[PDB]
Nuclear receptor ROR-gamma
Amino acid sequence: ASLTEIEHLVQSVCKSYRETCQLRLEDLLRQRSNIFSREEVTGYQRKSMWEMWERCAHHLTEAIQYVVEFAKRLSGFMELCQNDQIVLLKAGAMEVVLVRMCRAYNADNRTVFFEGKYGGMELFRALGCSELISSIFDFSHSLSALHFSEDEIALYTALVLINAHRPGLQEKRKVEQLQYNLELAFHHHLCKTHRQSILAKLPPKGKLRSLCSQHVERLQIFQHLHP
Protein backbone atom coordinates (compact mmCIF):
# COMPACT_ATOMS: atom_id res chain seq x y z
CA ALA A 1 0.00 0.00 0.00
CA SER A 2 0.82 3.74 -0.24
CA LEU A 3 0.17 5.97 2.79
CA THR A 4 -3.00 7.58 1.32
CA GLU A 5 -4.40 4.12 0.42
CA ILE A 6 -3.90 3.10 4.11
CA GLU A 7 -5.65 6.34 5.21
CA HIS A 8 -8.41 5.43 2.95
CA LEU A 9 -8.69 1.97 4.57
CA VAL A 10 -8.84 3.58 8.00
CA GLN A 11 -11.55 5.96 6.96
CA SER A 12 -13.65 3.20 5.48
CA VAL A 13 -13.41 0.91 8.51
CA CYS A 14 -14.28 3.85 10.75
CA LYS A 15 -17.37 4.62 8.56
CA SER A 16 -18.51 0.95 8.60
CA TYR A 17 -18.30 0.94 12.39
CA ARG A 18 -20.31 4.21 12.52
CA GLU A 19 -23.04 2.73 10.30
CA THR A 20 -23.29 -0.58 12.33
CA CYS A 21 -22.44 0.51 15.88
CA GLN A 22 -26.00 -0.30 16.97
CA LEU A 23 -26.21 2.21 19.90
CA ARG A 24 -24.65 5.62 19.31
CA LEU A 25 -22.04 6.63 21.82
CA GLU A 26 -23.72 10.03 22.48
CA ASP A 27 -26.95 8.31 23.59
CA LEU A 28 -25.11 5.80 25.84
CA LEU A 29 -23.23 8.64 27.53
CA ARG A 30 -26.35 10.76 27.99
CA GLN A 31 -28.18 7.75 29.57
CA ARG A 32 -25.56 7.13 32.32
CA SER A 33 -27.75 9.05 34.82
CA ASN A 34 -30.74 6.75 33.97
CA ILE A 35 -30.13 3.90 36.39
CA PHE A 36 -32.49 1.03 37.47
CA SER A 37 -34.19 1.67 40.82
CA ARG A 38 -33.85 -0.95 43.59
CA GLU A 39 -37.42 -2.17 42.86
CA GLU A 40 -36.68 -2.49 39.15
CA VAL A 41 -33.47 -4.43 40.05
CA THR A 42 -35.62 -6.64 42.37
CA GLY A 43 -37.97 -7.15 39.41
CA TYR A 44 -35.14 -8.53 37.26
CA GLN A 45 -33.83 -10.80 40.01
CA ARG A 46 -37.27 -12.28 40.49
CA LYS A 47 -37.51 -13.27 36.81
CA SER A 48 -36.79 -16.94 36.20
CA MET A 49 -33.47 -17.88 34.65
CA TRP A 50 -35.56 -18.92 31.63
CA GLU A 51 -36.92 -15.42 31.07
CA MET A 52 -33.57 -13.82 31.74
CA TRP A 53 -32.00 -16.20 29.29
CA GLU A 54 -34.57 -15.33 26.56
CA ARG A 55 -33.97 -11.62 27.10
CA CYS A 56 -30.16 -12.00 27.05
CA ALA A 57 -30.36 -14.23 23.96
CA HIS A 58 -32.49 -11.63 22.14
CA HIS A 59 -30.04 -8.76 22.89
CA LEU A 60 -27.04 -10.96 21.96
CA THR A 61 -28.61 -12.04 18.67
CA GLU A 62 -29.36 -8.39 17.87
CA ALA A 63 -25.78 -7.47 18.64
CA ILE A 64 -24.34 -10.21 16.53
CA GLN A 65 -26.53 -9.05 13.56
CA TYR A 66 -24.81 -5.65 13.74
CA VAL A 67 -21.33 -7.30 13.90
CA VAL A 68 -22.22 -9.33 10.82
CA GLU A 69 -23.28 -6.18 8.95
CA PHE A 70 -19.95 -4.58 9.99
CA ALA A 71 -17.99 -7.56 8.58
CA LYS A 72 -19.90 -7.28 5.33
CA ARG A 73 -18.73 -3.65 4.80
CA LEU A 74 -15.02 -4.32 5.47
CA SER A 75 -13.31 -4.27 2.05
CA GLY A 76 -12.32 -7.73 0.82
CA PHE A 77 -14.64 -9.48 3.28
CA MET A 78 -17.41 -10.04 0.74
CA GLU A 79 -14.89 -11.34 -1.89
CA LEU A 80 -13.88 -14.13 0.43
CA CYS A 81 -15.52 -17.47 -0.35
CA GLN A 82 -18.68 -17.98 1.72
CA ASN A 83 -16.95 -20.74 3.80
CA ASP A 84 -14.26 -18.32 5.10
CA GLN A 85 -16.74 -15.43 5.69
CA ILE A 86 -18.58 -17.95 7.94
CA VAL A 87 -15.45 -19.25 9.63
CA LEU A 88 -14.30 -15.77 10.55
CA LEU A 89 -17.76 -14.67 11.84
CA LYS A 90 -18.41 -17.91 13.75
CA ALA A 91 -15.06 -17.43 15.62
CA GLY A 92 -15.01 -13.66 16.13
CA ALA A 93 -18.57 -12.31 16.24
CA MET A 94 -19.12 -12.89 19.97
CA GLU A 95 -15.55 -11.63 20.71
CA VAL A 96 -16.48 -8.35 18.92
CA VAL A 97 -19.76 -8.08 20.85
CA LEU A 98 -17.76 -8.44 24.08
CA VAL A 99 -15.45 -5.62 23.00
CA ARG A 100 -18.41 -3.39 21.85
CA MET A 101 -19.93 -3.80 25.31
CA CYS A 102 -17.24 -1.53 26.80
CA ARG A 103 -19.03 1.43 25.12
CA ALA A 104 -22.18 0.61 27.12
CA TYR A 105 -20.34 0.28 30.46
CA ASN A 106 -19.85 2.92 33.17
CA ALA A 107 -16.68 2.24 35.17
CA ASP A 108 -17.65 4.89 37.80
CA ASN A 109 -20.53 2.81 39.18
CA ARG A 110 -19.85 -0.62 37.45
CA THR A 111 -23.10 -0.51 35.50
CA VAL A 112 -24.05 -1.57 31.98
CA PHE A 113 -26.75 -0.37 29.67
CA PHE A 114 -29.41 -3.11 29.57
CA GLU A 115 -32.98 -2.69 28.20
CA GLY A 116 -33.06 1.12 28.46
CA LYS A 117 -31.33 1.84 31.81
CA TYR A 118 -27.98 1.27 33.56
CA GLY A 119 -27.71 -1.62 36.09
CA GLY A 120 -25.01 -3.51 37.93
CA MET A 121 -24.16 -7.19 37.52
CA GLU A 122 -26.67 -8.02 40.36
CA LEU A 123 -29.31 -7.32 37.72
CA PHE A 124 -28.36 -10.74 36.31
CA ARG A 125 -28.63 -12.78 39.56
CA ALA A 126 -31.37 -15.17 38.23
CA LEU A 127 -28.99 -16.63 35.61
CA GLY A 128 -26.89 -18.03 38.46
CA CYS A 129 -23.54 -17.50 36.82
CA SER A 130 -21.99 -14.74 38.77
CA GLU A 131 -18.49 -16.03 37.90
CA LEU A 132 -19.12 -15.47 34.24
CA ILE A 133 -20.98 -12.17 34.60
CA SER A 134 -18.28 -10.69 36.88
CA SER A 135 -15.51 -11.63 34.40
CA ILE A 136 -17.53 -9.89 31.66
CA PHE A 137 -17.90 -6.81 33.83
CA ASP A 138 -14.19 -7.10 34.72
CA PHE A 139 -13.21 -7.30 31.06
CA SER A 140 -15.28 -4.18 30.20
CA HIS A 141 -13.82 -2.34 33.20
CA SER A 142 -10.36 -3.23 31.81
CA LEU A 143 -11.32 -1.82 28.42
CA SER A 144 -13.05 1.36 29.72
CA ALA A 145 -9.90 2.44 31.53
CA LEU A 146 -8.20 2.74 28.11
CA HIS A 147 -10.87 5.29 27.02
CA PHE A 148 -11.21 3.58 23.69
CA SER A 149 -12.23 5.93 20.93
CA GLU A 150 -14.88 5.08 18.33
CA ASP A 151 -12.28 4.69 15.67
CA GLU A 152 -9.97 2.57 17.83
CA ILE A 153 -12.92 0.22 18.42
CA ALA A 154 -13.59 0.14 14.71
CA LEU A 155 -10.03 -0.86 13.79
CA TYR A 156 -9.41 -3.19 16.72
CA THR A 157 -12.68 -5.06 16.15
CA ALA A 158 -12.03 -5.44 12.46
CA LEU A 159 -8.73 -7.17 13.50
CA VAL A 160 -10.71 -9.32 15.95
CA LEU A 161 -12.62 -10.59 12.87
CA ILE A 162 -9.99 -10.61 10.13
CA ASN A 163 -7.62 -13.18 11.60
CA ALA A 164 -5.80 -15.60 9.31
CA HIS A 165 -5.16 -18.19 12.08
CA ARG A 166 -8.82 -19.34 12.52
CA PRO A 167 -9.01 -23.08 11.55
CA GLY A 168 -10.95 -24.24 8.49
CA LEU A 169 -10.02 -21.20 6.37
CA GLN A 170 -10.09 -22.42 2.77
CA GLU A 171 -8.15 -19.33 1.45
CA LYS A 172 -5.87 -18.55 4.36
CA ARG A 173 -3.66 -16.37 2.10
CA LYS A 174 -6.50 -13.92 1.18
CA VAL A 175 -7.30 -13.50 4.87
CA GLU A 176 -3.62 -12.83 5.65
CA GLN A 177 -3.50 -10.08 3.10
CA LEU A 178 -6.62 -8.43 4.50
CA GLN A 179 -5.35 -8.79 8.08
CA TYR A 180 -1.97 -7.31 7.06
CA ASN A 181 -3.64 -4.26 5.44
CA LEU A 182 -5.86 -3.69 8.54
CA GLU A 183 -2.85 -4.01 10.83
CA LEU A 184 -1.02 -1.36 8.78
CA ALA A 185 -4.16 0.81 9.03
CA PHE A 186 -4.49 0.35 12.76
CA HIS A 187 -0.87 1.11 13.54
CA HIS A 188 -0.89 4.08 11.17
CA HIS A 189 -3.97 5.63 12.78
CA LEU A 190 -2.45 5.20 16.27
CA CYS A 191 0.53 7.27 15.04
CA LYS A 192 -1.73 10.02 13.54
CA THR A 193 -3.75 10.25 16.79
CA HIS A 194 -0.78 9.86 19.15
CA ARG A 195 -2.26 6.73 20.70
CA GLN A 196 0.66 4.31 20.21
CA SER A 197 0.50 3.90 23.97
CA ILE A 198 -2.69 1.75 23.83
CA LEU A 199 -1.03 -1.20 21.87
CA ALA A 200 0.73 -2.65 24.87
CA LYS A 201 -2.44 -2.04 26.95
CA LEU A 202 -4.80 -4.13 24.67
CA PRO A 203 -6.10 -7.48 26.05
CA PRO A 204 -3.78 -10.49 25.50
CA LYS A 205 -5.45 -12.00 22.35
CA GLY A 206 -6.06 -15.31 24.19
CA LYS A 207 -7.95 -13.28 26.85
CA LEU A 208 -10.85 -12.67 24.45
CA ARG A 209 -10.81 -16.28 23.06
CA SER A 210 -10.88 -17.70 26.53
CA LEU A 211 -13.66 -15.37 27.75
CA CYS A 212 -15.77 -15.98 24.66
CA SER A 213 -15.38 -19.78 24.85
CA GLN A 214 -16.69 -19.67 28.48
CA HIS A 215 -19.55 -17.23 27.57
CA VAL A 216 -20.59 -19.46 24.58
CA GLU A 217 -20.48 -22.58 26.90
CA ARG A 218 -23.12 -20.93 29.12
CA LEU A 219 -25.12 -19.89 26.02
CA GLN A 220 -24.66 -23.50 24.77
CA ILE A 221 -26.30 -24.82 28.02
CA PHE A 222 -29.25 -22.35 27.78
CA GLN A 223 -30.11 -22.59 23.98
CA HIS A 224 -29.99 -26.44 23.76
CA LEU A 225 -32.98 -27.25 25.97
CA HIS A 226 -35.55 -24.55 25.13
CA PRO A 227 -34.46 -22.60 22.00
